[PDB]
Amino acid sequence: LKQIREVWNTYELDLVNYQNKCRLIRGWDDLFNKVKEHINSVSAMKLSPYYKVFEEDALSWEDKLNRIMALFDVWIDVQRRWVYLEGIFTGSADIKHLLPVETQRFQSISTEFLALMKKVSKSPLVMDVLNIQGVQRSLERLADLLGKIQKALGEYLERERSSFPRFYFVGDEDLLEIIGNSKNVAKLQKHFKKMFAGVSSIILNEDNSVVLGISSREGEEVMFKTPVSITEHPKINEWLTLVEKEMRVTLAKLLAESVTEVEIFGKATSIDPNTYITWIDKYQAQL
Amino acid sequence: QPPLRRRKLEHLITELVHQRDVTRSLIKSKIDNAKSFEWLSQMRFYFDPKQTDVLQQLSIQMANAKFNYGFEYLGVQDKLVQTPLTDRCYLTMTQALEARLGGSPFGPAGTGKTESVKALGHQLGRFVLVFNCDETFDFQAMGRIFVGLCQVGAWGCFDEFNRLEERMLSAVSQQVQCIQEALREHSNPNYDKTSAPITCELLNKQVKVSPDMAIFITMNLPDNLKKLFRSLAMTKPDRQLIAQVMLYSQGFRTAEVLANKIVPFFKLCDEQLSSQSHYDFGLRALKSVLVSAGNVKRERIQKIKREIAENLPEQEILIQSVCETMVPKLVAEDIPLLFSLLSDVFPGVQYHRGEMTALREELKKVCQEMYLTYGDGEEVGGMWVEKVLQLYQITQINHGLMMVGPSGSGKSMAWRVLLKALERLEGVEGVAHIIDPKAISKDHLYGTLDPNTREWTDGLFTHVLRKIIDSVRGELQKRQWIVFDGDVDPEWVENLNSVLDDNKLLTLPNGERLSLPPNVRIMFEVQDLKYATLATVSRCGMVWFSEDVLSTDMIFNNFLARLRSIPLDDSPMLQIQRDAATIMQPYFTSNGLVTKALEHAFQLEHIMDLTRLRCLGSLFSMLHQACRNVAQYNANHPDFPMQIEQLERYIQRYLVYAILWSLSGDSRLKMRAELGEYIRRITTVPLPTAPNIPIIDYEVSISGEWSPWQAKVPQIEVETHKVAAPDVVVPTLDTVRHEALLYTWLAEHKPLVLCGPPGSGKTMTLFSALRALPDMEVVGLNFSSATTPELLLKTFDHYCEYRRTPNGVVLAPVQLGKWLVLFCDEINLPDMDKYGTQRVISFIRQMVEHGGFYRTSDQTWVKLERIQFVGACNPPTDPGRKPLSHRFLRHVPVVYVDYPGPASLTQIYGTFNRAMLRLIPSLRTYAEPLTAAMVEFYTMSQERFTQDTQPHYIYSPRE
Amino acid sequence: IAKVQADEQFGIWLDSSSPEQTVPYLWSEETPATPIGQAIHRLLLIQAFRPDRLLAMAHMFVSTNLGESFMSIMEQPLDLTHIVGTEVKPNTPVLMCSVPGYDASGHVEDLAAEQNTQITSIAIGSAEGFNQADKAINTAVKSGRWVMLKNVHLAPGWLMQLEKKLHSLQPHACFRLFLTMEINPKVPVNLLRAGRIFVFEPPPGVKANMLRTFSSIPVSRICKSPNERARLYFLLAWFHAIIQERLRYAPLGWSKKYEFGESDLRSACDTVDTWLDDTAKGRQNISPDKIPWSALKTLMAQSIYGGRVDNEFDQRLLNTFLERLFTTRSFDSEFKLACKVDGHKDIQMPDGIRREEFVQWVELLPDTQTPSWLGLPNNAERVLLTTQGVDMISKMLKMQAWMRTLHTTASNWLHLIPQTLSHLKRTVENIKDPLFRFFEREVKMGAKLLQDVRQDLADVVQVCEGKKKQTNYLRTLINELVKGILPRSWSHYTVPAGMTVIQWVSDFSERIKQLQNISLAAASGGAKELKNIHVCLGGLFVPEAYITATRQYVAQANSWSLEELCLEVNVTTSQGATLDACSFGVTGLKLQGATCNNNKLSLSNAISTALPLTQLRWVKQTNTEKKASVVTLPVYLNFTRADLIFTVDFEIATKEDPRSFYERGVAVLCT
Numbered sequence A: 001l002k003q004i005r006e007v008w009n010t011y012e013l014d015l016v017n018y019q020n021k022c023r024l025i026r027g028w029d030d031l032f033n034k035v036k037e038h039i040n041s042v043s044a045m046k047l048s049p050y051y052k053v054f055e056e057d058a059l060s061w062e063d064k065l066n067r068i069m070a071l072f073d074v075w076i077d078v079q080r081r082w083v084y085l086e087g088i089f090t091g092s093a094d095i096k097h098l099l100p101v102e103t104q105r106f107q108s109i110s111t112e113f114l115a116l117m118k119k120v121s122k123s124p125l126v127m128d129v130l131n132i133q134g135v136q137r138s139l140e141r142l143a144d145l146l147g148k149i150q151k152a153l154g155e156y157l158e159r160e161r162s163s164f165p166r167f168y169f170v171g172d173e174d175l176l177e178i179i180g181n182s183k184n185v186a187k188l189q190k191h192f193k194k195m196f197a198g199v200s201s202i203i204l205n206e207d208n209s210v211v212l213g214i215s216s217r218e219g220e221e222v223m224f225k226t227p228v229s230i231t232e233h234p235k236i237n238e239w240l241t242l243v244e245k246e247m248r249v250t251l252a253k254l255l256a257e258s259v260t261e262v263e264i265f266g267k268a269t270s271i272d273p274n275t276y277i278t279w280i281d282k283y284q285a286q287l
Numbered sequence B: 001q002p003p004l005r006r007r008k009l010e011h012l013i014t015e016l017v018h019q020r021d022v023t024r025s026l027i028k029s030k031i032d033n034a035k036s037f038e039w040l041s042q043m044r045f046y047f048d049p050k051q052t053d054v055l056q057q058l059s060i061q062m063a064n065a066k067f068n069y070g071f072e073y074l075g076v077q078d079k080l081v082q083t084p085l086t087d088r089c090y091l092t093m094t095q096a097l098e099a100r101l102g103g104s105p106f107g108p109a110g111t112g113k114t115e116s117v118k119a120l121g122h123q124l125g126r127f128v129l130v131f132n133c134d135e136t137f138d139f140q141a142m143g144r145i146f147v148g149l150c151q152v153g154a155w156g157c158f159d160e161f162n163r164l165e166e167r168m169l170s171a172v173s174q175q176v177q178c179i180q181e182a183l184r185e186h187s188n189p190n191y192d193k194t195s196a197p198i199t200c201e202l203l204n205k206q207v208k209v210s211p212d213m214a215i216f217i218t219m220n221l222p223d224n225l226k227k228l229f230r231s232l233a234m235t236k237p238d239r240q241l242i243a244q245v246m247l248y249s250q251g252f253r254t255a256e257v258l259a260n261k262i263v264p265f266f267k268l269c270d271e272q273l274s275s276q277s278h279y280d281f282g283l284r285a286l287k288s289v290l291v292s293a294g295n296v297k298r299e300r301i302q303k304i305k306r307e308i309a310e311n312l313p314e315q316e317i318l319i320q321s322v323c324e325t326m327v328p329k330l331v332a333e334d335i336p337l338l339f340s341l342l343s344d345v346f347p348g349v350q351y352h353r354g355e356m357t358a359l360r361e362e363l364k365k366v367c368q369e370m371y372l373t374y375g376d377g378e379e380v381g382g383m384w385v386e387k388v389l390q391l392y393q394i395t396q397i398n399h400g401l402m403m404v405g406p407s408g409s410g411k412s413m414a415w416r417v418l419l420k421a422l423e424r425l426e427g428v429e430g431v432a433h434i435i436d437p438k439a440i441s442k443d444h445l446y447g448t449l450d451p452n453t454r455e456w457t458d459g460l461f462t463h464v465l466r467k468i469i470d471s472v473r474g475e476l477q478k479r480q481w482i483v484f485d486g487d488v489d490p491e492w493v494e495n496l497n498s499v500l501d502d503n504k505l506l507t508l509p510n511g512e513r514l515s516l517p518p519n520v521r522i523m524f525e526v527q528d529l530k531y532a533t534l535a536t537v538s539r540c541g542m543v544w545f546s547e548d549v550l551s552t553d554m555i556f557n558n559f560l561a562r563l564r565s566i567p568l569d570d571s572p573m574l575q576i577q578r579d580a581a582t583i584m585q586p587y588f589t590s591n592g593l594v595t596k597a598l599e600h601a602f603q604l605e606h607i608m609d610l611t612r613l614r615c616l617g618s619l620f621s622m623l624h625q626a627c628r629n630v631a632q633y634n635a636n637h638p639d640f641p642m643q644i645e646q647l648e649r650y651i652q653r654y655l656v657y658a659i660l661w662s663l664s665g666d667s668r669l670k671m672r673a674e675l676g677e678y679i680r681r682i683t684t685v686p687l688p689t690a691p692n693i694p695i696i697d698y699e700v701s702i703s704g705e706w707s708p709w710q711a712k713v714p715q716i717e718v719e720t721h722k723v724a725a726p727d728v729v730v731p732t733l734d735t736v737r738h739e740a741l742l743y744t745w746l747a748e749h750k751p752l753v754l755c756g757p758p759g760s761g762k763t764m765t766l767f768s769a770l771r772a773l774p775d776m777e778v779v780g781l782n783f784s785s786a787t788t789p790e791l792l793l794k795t796f797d798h799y800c801e802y803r804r805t806p807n808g809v810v811l812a813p814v815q816l817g818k819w820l821v822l823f824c825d826e827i828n829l830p831d832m833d834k835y836g837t838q839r840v841i842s843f844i845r846q847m848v849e850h851g852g853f854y855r856t857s858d859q860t861w862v863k864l865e866r867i868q869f870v871g872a873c874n875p876p877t878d879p880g881r882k883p884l885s886h887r888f889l890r891h892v893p894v895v896y897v898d899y900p901g902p903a904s905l906t907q908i909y910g911t912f913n914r915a916m917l918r919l920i921p922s923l924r925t926y927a928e929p930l931t932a933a934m935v936e937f938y939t940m941s942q943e944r945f946t947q948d949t950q951p952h953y954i955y956s957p958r959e
Numbered sequence C: 001i002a003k004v005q006a007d008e009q010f011g012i013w014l015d016s017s018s019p020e021q022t023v024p025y026l027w028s029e030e031t032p033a034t035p036i037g038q039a040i041h042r043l044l045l046i047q048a049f050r051p052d053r054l055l056a057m058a059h060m061f062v063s064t065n066l067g068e069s070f071m072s073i074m075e076q077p078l079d080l081t082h083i084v085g086t087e088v089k090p091n092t093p094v095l096m097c098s099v100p101g102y103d104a105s106g107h108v109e110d111l112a113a114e115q116n117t118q119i120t121s122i123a124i125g126s127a128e129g130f131n132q133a134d135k136a137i138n139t140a141v142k143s144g145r146w147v148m149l150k151n152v153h154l155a156p157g158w159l160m161q162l163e164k165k166l167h168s169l170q171p172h173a174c175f176r177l178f179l180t181m182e183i184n185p186k187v188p189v190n191l192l193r194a195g196r197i198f199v200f201e202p203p204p205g206v207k208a209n210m211l212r213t214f215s216s217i218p219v220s221r222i223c224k225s226p227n228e229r230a231r232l233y234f235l236l237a238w239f240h241a242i243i244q245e246r247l248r249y250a251p252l253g254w255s256k257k258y259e260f261g262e263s264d265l266r267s268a269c270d271t272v273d274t275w276l277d278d279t280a281k282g283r284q285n286i287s288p289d290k291i292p293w294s295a296l297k298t299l300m301a302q303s304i305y306g307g308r309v310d311n312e313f314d315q316r317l318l319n320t321f322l323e324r325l326f327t328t329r330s331f332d333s334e335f336k337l338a339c340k341v342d343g344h345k346d347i348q349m350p351d352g353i354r355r356e357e358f359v360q361w362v363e364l365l366p367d368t369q370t371p372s373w374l375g376l377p378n379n380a381e382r383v384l385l386t387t388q389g390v391d392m393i394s395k396m397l398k399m400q401a402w403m404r405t406l407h408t409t410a411s412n413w414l415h416l417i418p419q420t421l422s423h424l425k426r427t428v429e430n431i432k433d434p435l436f437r438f439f440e441r442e443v444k445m446g447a448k449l450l451q452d453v454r455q456d457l458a459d460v461v462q463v464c465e466g467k468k469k470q471t472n473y474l475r476t477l478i479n480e481l482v483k484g485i486l487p488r489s490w491s492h493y494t495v496p497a498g499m500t501v502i503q504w505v506s507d508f509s510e511r512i513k514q515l516q517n518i519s520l521a522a523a524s525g526g527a528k529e530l531k532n533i534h535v536c537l538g539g540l541f542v543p544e545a546y547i548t549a550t551r552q553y554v555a556q557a558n559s560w561s562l563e564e565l566c567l568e569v570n571v572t573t574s575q576g577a578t579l580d581a582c583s584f585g586v587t588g589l590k591l592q593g594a595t596c597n598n599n600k601l602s603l604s605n606a607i608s609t610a611l612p613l614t615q616l617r618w619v620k621q622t623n624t625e626k627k628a629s630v631v632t633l634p635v636y637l638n639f640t641r642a643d644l645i646f647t648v649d650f651e652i653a654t655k656e657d658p659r660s661f662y663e664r665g666v667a668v669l670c671t
């Protein structure tokens, strides 16, 4: 108990900087294992009959240790949720236009959290911040808000992934990048490799507004019979489904044309190498 | 043809050969009805473009199942040769899909079960997915992957499903069983027409199941799926048919004769050849050989054209492709066997190698200036340049080359000379990043993110790749060869497996990807593949550097070339070195004194496993001191320098002395006597006259005379307070010779290890010379089981300072002019890893050989300035003494400090007794009997009651 | 020996069908007339003479030691109602264990029918199924309702939880829990130890198999459409019963035990239904010729029954059976199910149109069933009986200080095992010879194995004497030797799956002996004796490599290539028969179920006929089709048929047909 009464007098929060130039709590193993050891020790000495030198010195600090444990094991969850959603909401674009209410609620939550971070940074003492009223209640409020908004984000991801079910083959981060970088259509082409069998790029227009066709790893191109305009279908899932459907239709049309052409070669015993090679060159290997 | 049109052609020949065989079988069977099964069993196509809906215009019917064509663009892909086994596989899978079941092809891996399923899925146009169930399996992703398969209409293939461990296997089997039981309802006898689609539950919610999807479970099965999966035995593929069709599609005339020869050859390669961990004689390897043969044939025909014309020998082209792929992976023993097999399968034809005379003339110039040995054939060095050229070929083809071979081969020299030769020939610079794994943590190799700030910091390899990619600094015009010298291990190649393959991209844990630029070559200079995953070895080509490639003559030539040109004192030193090299030149030839002595020493018994380079390095190191004893002798006597006549007689005897103390410096005294006796009967150097005294008991002096060591042992009298005190060694026969060897091997600043029984006097003999030298300050370090490179780093930070980049970061001791020696107490004690590499040993090796290491704080190369290492070991046979690796062993010579003999013990303690009895003058006459009793009783207790009865019966001079 | 010199009736008794009812008196005993002494003496004699009757004589011994009513209770059908009414505590759950391919829920169902007690039958395997079963258990313990779970073995964790929960007492005595589950080694042992175990097996026999299959097939699915569907279903039942009854005779039948449960029969029935619907669209009586014979044969030979066939020869046999049965001739009146049965009898088709006639014929099948029903030789029963007897002997031997006995047997092994093997011949002119290379590698690896075995056995001898201390490797080696199981470190060549260490050291000594002879021959001559060695193929570590080396030597001796050669065999009688330039003499080959006069095979009831000095000749093949009077016999290495060495072509006699040889399971065995 002699060391317990002095360990809390000198205890720093070990603030660390963030990529957004904000302070955060870094030490967690010390903030948990040492506190658990102290609370176990005080419980043991209160239980042990050898306590007639400390008749009342740990009960006034057992509640303090409980408060420390509760505050910090809610704070760690609040911090991890806040940093994860900060990365999600700042890294990817269009998160302001898509889910705007979520964006504004997270902005308000981040404002409150950064105000609390500044408050705890101005006095980087655990005792000096436990004395601050309303920290615990605000912390449960923040934890509930982060949980609710993260659940809403997951539900939105599931809702967008159900449409155009090809998105089920990619992870949450990749899907977030795909749905966020709607303007930066040149970043989508690193994910088509896994969402299709062979299709690796989409041949856009000159201004990257109309999808003219697709490609493959080798470089084989399949010109769309009917181009799809992203400007008339701003949502990414809509024009992706349109690309898939137009690709199916184009494959069917080119198969019909190729079989019509090859009927002539098949029926005739005499085959000219020039026309046969041109027919091979014109049509895709699959067809 | 263009490559895309070439692939289109090859697919067309494949399918047309299939159709030709089908039509020939139909004609031979005299088939006339269109509903006969022998025609209804073939995959038939029906196209009707009149139907409005895109999906069912094309219909495919195997036997009775009527699938549609899912119009999904497959790209180009690869088409499998339709063998009878593939036909049966297609039939069985189609029948299983008709009954709403799944396909479970089983058989040995390499048959093509997964590829057959993928080819069938591509035939119908379905988006078939393959999941690797051996490792790198993301069970968390399957929860959404299965929903995607259900809601898209995509297939699924699980390669080697049984390889999954039971915990993951049960959950995946449960999900697959749910899918199959939900899909079986689509063919209900009373609910065939499903107005509401049948739904299952995978994500704890109901999801619609499209009838188009499928799931295949390949093996090498759980009772959940036994009733819902058909099985097929894909045991052996028809390799002859596959080869014949690929040969015919590559333009090879008389394809069947080549195929029914190459297939038996690849069968013999698995029997007459010694089994190796890297030999690949499977179907996949056969295909790579056939396409290489096609490329070679096209190159030959287009070269003959520029000088249709179909008269080239096809067999001589098929054996050139084989010899350009199998020979680099062959050990020295299998090489004469491969050509013997070729002389049987392909009698009369022979393999002719490309001369590559453009590079074999820059090799001769990169060599002969690095004092190396060059050859051109059966002459010395031919095998080495051959291996260098093969390594160049592998660099040209692949990018993840892995040079392999036993310690002592010229692996490092080969790739260095190749880099310099390429730099000279092509005018393109070459920079090598020798990253050593198993010395830094995997986190320090790649990096990590702290779970609190999520800040990403890069490791060594990640930082190197980022510098190469982001910063140009002659990116495409500098050859970045990231040599991964060390030992191969799955742990640090899990991340690299994404880089070795064709992806050429690294997936960092933060999610960022870095694409390998085409100039970067990731090479793993390793010793053996005992602890390498099959994926890592299979994702990259290799060349085997057998120990027969580097001959002894080449090592001797390298030494004598370095001696005559490199000055030991960093002008008269060069002259005396050249004279000495001329003197020992007759002995440093093929056969002769040194070679015969080495051959005889290889059949003796030594405390540690005998390595040629270890003995050769020690011999060269002591000979480098033999040319310095000349320098000091001339410096001390400015007039009357030691002329050629005295030099000859000095060095002829010094060579024998060094041979004796290098080839038997790690064996018992009986073995030393045996080596001396063998030398006496095969040498022409005047030896000690007395035959009863071993040559080991003599010194060469400086006048070229055999002066016995007993003439250099003084009789000392210690003070009474200094009797048996710590750090007090009485001169004897062993402390006059082992001390001399220690001084000789420390004058070269060569790391070394003293190996001997516990208590013999390794530490005493070492500290008797370390602190005697004015500038050899000693730092004490103890190596136990738990020791890691962090101990060495802490010692360096405690005693050494990092110079602020004089020319790069340099680690130097705090004080100037003093050499630190980190005495390694029990260097072989550190615990054996589960993958056969002691991390601290590989860490100290990095700086014993490459002269430095890599900082973990800024990924910067730091070079040791004045740091020396010394070692000590108990014999490896003792428990807890893990034998050292050959890669580090060859760099450190060892000295066997055996237990002092009876008489030697007498001369050591008798002196202590006399100084101790000065407190009792009445008993000076009893000093000798007291010692004679003590030593005799100690010997009696040593002879019996040894370690065999109990593990604590250690009797040493310490007692 | 002197006793059996006389008593000419000894041979007749040796040839008796059941030589256990009367056994000649051979033991030299004067006074002992106790029944048990005579029983055990006759049992030892039966283990000596005719070991196939070992089970019969064991049954007679148990009868003489416990009365002739002891095992008779096991024959009667078990009445579970008496067991579960009195001596089954409702705490103890009845385990309804069944061999895979069988279901026992019908037994508890008929028990409920006779006991007029409701059953809360629950299927196991669904996620909600566990919750529903738990709720039923909770609501049934308070009311004594008989809860019966089906295939509960699927979930081991839930079964463990149920076993732990069952320790709580049940209010109602009428409760009777039934956990129907198959014989799966993943079931928790606690449940088995804490519950009553009932084992159920399918009754052996073709007739029982057809009863089971016909009861499995619904009546509606077998009656509609053309009535030829009924005979097709009957043929399917015969084929399925045959291919399951042949599984019992695993070595002589199908090389490996394939899993042919109800799924294959369901797939075959679905295939037949679909293809008869397609071929016969209406309901007219389709002619037998229009039956899609080729479709059904191909589908059931490469898709639903050939999909589990691992090697070529089993596929050939499956094709042989399907060709014999599924043909338009099967709808005639004189078509035989299987000839040669009981010597010369036959089995006819029931000339039926409805399932009732086929079922009545099936139940009319005679009780006696020789292996000739399956096409196998009549002595396959003797082989199986001998195997079961030796298995019983091993099972009881495992049902039985030892320092001295182990030391004595180790010393006896050391004395019996030959000394070290020498490989001191390597000539540069002999490197080219492929036979020299193969013999060099064989001798080298065999000598290394011999040295390792010698060192380990000497260490075992020394540690038995007490002058040495055993280590973990030595400890596990002793644990393996005490139980007579082959050490894993001593296995470097293919051996039968499970074989005694004494047999291993004996055949290892034989192999070392032939290797010493090979080394002596290679020391005497370099390239002349190696061809003239009458090597024993069984003793080779990799005999397929020996065949490859012989082919290489023949190709290199002439100018021919390796792929231009085909094997030709000529069995001789005299051991001193001269070898040709390409002829290679081998010994130890054994022919199963057949014999040869000069070079023409002929069927014989006595299996394992020794082939003296089989000559392997390599000749330049003409790429011509083989005739119909020759067969391709597999050449296995062990008595168990698991590994293929090569294939041998033999001329059959002028009467027998290749199909009979294929369906009798004939082969050539090295050991």
Ligand SMILES: Nc1ncnc2c1ncn2[C@@H]1O[C@H](COP(=O)(O)OP(=O)(O)OP(=O)(O)O)[C@@H](O)[C@H]1O
Pocket: B371, B372, B373, B374, B384, B405, B406, B407, B408, B409, B410, B411, B412, B413, B414, B525, B527, B550, B554, B555, B557, B558, B559, B613, B886, B887, B888, B890
């Ligand atoms: N012509 C030569 N070719 C190759 N090595 C030579 C030649 N002449 C001398 N040598 C010596 O051969 C040795 C080659 O060892 P190398 O540097 O290739 O080893 P490593 O691959 O780094 O390590 P390890 O030997 O443990 O596998 C060196 O001691 C080198 O000086």
Ligand SMILES: Nc1ncnc2c1ncn2[C@@H]1O[C@H](COP(=O)(O)OP(=O)(O)O)[C@@H](O)[C@H]1O
Pocket: B079, B080, B081, B082, B083, B086, B108, B109, B110, B111, B112, B113, B114, B115, B116, B159, B218, B237, B242, B283, B284, B287
């Ligand atoms: N019929 C075939 N024609 C051509 N190549 C084939 C054929 N069957 C298999 N292969 C090849 O065999 C190799 C091994 O296939 P893989 O799917 O890895 O086998 P497995 O599933 O047995 O492990 C691949 O290179 C594949 O293309």
Ligand SMILES: Nc1ncnc2c1ncn2[C@@H]1O[C@H](COP(=O)(O)OP(=O)(O)O)[C@@H](O)[C@H]1O
Pocket: B724, B728, B729, B730, B731, B732, B735, B756, B757, B758, B759, B760, B761, B762, B763, B764, B900, B908, B957, B958, B959
């Ligand atoms: N000349 C000598 N030769 C050998 N041992 C000696 C000699 N002089 C002293 N000793 C004794 O040898 C022992 C060596 O102990 P230590 O240095 O721990 O041996 P090691 O390094 O072999 O474990 C000490 O007891 C030391 O006093």
